[PDB]
Ligand binder design. Structure first.
Ligand SMILES: [Zn+2]
Ligand SMILES: [Zn+2]
Ligand SMILES: [Zn+2]
Ligand SMILES: [Zn+2]
Lengths: 231, 231, 231, 231
DNA sequence: TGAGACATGCCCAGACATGCCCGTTT
DNA sequence: ACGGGCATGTCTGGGCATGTCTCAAA
């Protein structure tokens, strides 16, 4: 079974938010909106902001899980490479197989589901600190997005979800994460192969569309991309 | 007896949906909008969606059984060549003789009717989560649609039924499959054969777009339209 | 264990000889000396000549065995593809797994060694028929040099050997065989990629060789290829 | 404890020999007379010849062991990386953790010396088949020479040794290994960086040659000799 | 540390490979 | 009865991907 990744703000307008990269511990963790992807170094900290309109009811929790992005791999549980699964790199509260880890919260709980066989981590929801309108959370990924025996270069996706005391869904969101050794580089590169997927390709193509009422449906459809593009 | 490929939605809405993606020569899957055919590689994952209207009673199961579309052999069991049939992989819960399997679903069941010796698989039916509005089971075909001493190029058609808790009918639909090597290829090419095979008649509407795949999906997203005027 | 393929005429000057192709059942079996390779169709007859100086002692036998040509494959026994291993295409005297078969000799014996696990066939040595100075023998190969589960396109090598009553070696020889569906074609093609491996490549390269006495060793060495080439 | 590598021909003039393969990135194994190094891909065949002036006593054995080359790690037992170790390969006759395996020899024995803890495999010595004047033996290296949590990019040295019935040293020789994914390329480079690092001292005669493949062949014959006057 | 410059495992668009199915000549 | 397109599985050199080492400048 492959858990959903469908965005769903729920009745609390739950959604995620990230920070920029170019100061202190930034090159060791950068986010590119154009890709909605987080580039980060093995075992280094990645901060994430939880935004919510109203306020979650008592007992509310926040969970984080990973699924592969590509379809031929989804059904495959995202484990940790074997080499690393055998290392003292564990605060103690978190099992060695788990890829994702919450940093700085002894209230965090790790789960290795009996049925789905999926790996996840949960923490009690906490209200924003007076001043800011979000609750930042810290994550750490324990294997490179290219370890053999592990993810094996298969792009992964992190699904953050807001569940109630009973576990029921209340809101969901997600983002792509690539663990590596040169976040800055890999980000540029990828932001480049994109800034080269629009210019490099410019040729035009036509299409025959029968139906007076149908043409206006494709017209107003394509007349829409003509705006959100040249800008 | 012989299984019917009658497009029987049922009284709930047991239909089919497939992911819209490119058709370059490097992908493992790619659907035939037109021919309702599939082009997944050997042993790769096949994402099959299942929309509906009303939730069937607590027990409805889904099943998969293959059939050769060609009238000549449309009465012969769809097995595996003794080669791969003599091969066991990471799956100690799914017989080597069966063609179709489901990925991640320990609730699955593979059986050969003691009357038809038919290869079929039945996996429990789960309803859509909160937010989303459908469900997709992950199928995996274990043999090329051209392996000598088996299917042997004989085109096929997967019959996905929605039989209730007592094996009785309650929904059904099907689609063609082509376990080939370059899914993009035998999709770019097995498609043009229906893009020069006839000239036809009619007066469309002129509408040109932009983009390579951006459009390759656009003109592609032009087939699912006029199909509501014949059968 | 990979049996030897080292040519060895022995004390009887044992060696092999073939015929030309371009008459009757020729296109269904051709030999190209430039390659010392026999191109032949599945299940069709291939004739081979056994030449020997003196005359083998009483009890002498002749064996034929196949080994893969490429090194990463030698250690692999040359079996028959699974599809074919299950067919009535057997005179009865010869097991279905065996690739090589002697045609027209009920005195022939097939072996499936207990240790080497190799497949072989043997026949009592017979003197030339008055007139010719050789003993022709007939072979048949029961799988295409490209059957999956079988040789799988891996080039094979046939080692004919002259053993005594006890089994001791007395002479050995060998030749390359490719089973296919278009011997003529495949032969030309290959005789072409060769007639294109000498002309296509002509550039010269130099080499520094210290040692007065050593230079004359490479001189008389290369001064040798200058003769057997332009001719 | 660290085993000796000091060559030792012994009273039977024991020493190894290798084939003469090329460098196309399609080769799976390829030795270097220059570097006296083998470049084989993961789990592929590496034939090693065994020459001996006189035949050994009844019971003589050949044992092959690996050692890290570098003085720093020369005391660290060579094991398979965590990943490949957790893979039971179609060779249940051999320990899942042994780096070196032998192919096609049921009489082979794998070892885990209690004291030293080193790993090695042994096989009974076999006299050269008539006509031939040496014995080859087939090995496989179950792990790239850079698996992490394994050799981890550390060069190793395989020490073939000839021991007797009562395991006494009889002779010994060795060679360098590297398990890649491009034995062709990797060797070209490594061989090239030597074919530049040295200038040597002397008077060199000049010999022009025709043909890249042929030239490369002499060049090899010549670099091998240029080693027969170094160490 | 920040940017090259390697090192070394792997993708791949574009050929090649190889069994066949026509159709038509010596 | 041997040259010709054809349906399909597959090889391959040129390039790309991804961790890590190395030297000079805030
Ligand atoms: Zn790892
Ligand atoms: Zn098959
Ligand atoms: Zn076969
Ligand atoms: Zn390994």
């Amino acid at each position: 079974s492959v858990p959903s990744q469908k965005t769903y703000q729920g009745s609390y307008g739950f959604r995620l938010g990230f920070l920029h990269s170019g100061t202190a511990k930034s090159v060791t963790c950068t986010y590119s909106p154009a890709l909605n992807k987080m580039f980060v170094q093995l075992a280094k900290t990645v901060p994430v902001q939880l935004y919510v309109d109203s306020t979650p009811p008592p007992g509310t929790r926040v969970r984080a899980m990973a699924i592969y992005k590509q379809s031929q791999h989804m059904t495959e549980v995202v484990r940790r490479c074997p080499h690393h699964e055998r290392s003292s790199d564990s605060d103690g509260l978190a099992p060695p197989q788990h890829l994702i880890r919450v940093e700085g919260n002894l209230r965090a709980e790790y789960l290795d589901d009996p049925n789905t066989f999926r790996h996840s981590v949960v923490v009690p929801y906490e209200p924003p600190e007076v001043g800011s309108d979000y609750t930042t959370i810290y994550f750490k990924f324990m294997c490179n997005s290219s370890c053999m025996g592990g993810m094996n270069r298969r792009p992964i996706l992190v699904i953050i979800t807001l569940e109630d005391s009973s576990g029921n869904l209340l809101g969901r969101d997600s983002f792509e994460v690539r663990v590596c050794a040169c976040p800055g580089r890999d980000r540029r590169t990828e932001e480049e192969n994109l800034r080269k997927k629009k210019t490099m390709d410019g040729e035009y193509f036509t299409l025959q569309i029968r139906g007076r009422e149908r043409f206006e449906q494709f017209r107003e459809r394509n007349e829409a991309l003509e705006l959100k593009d040249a800008q």
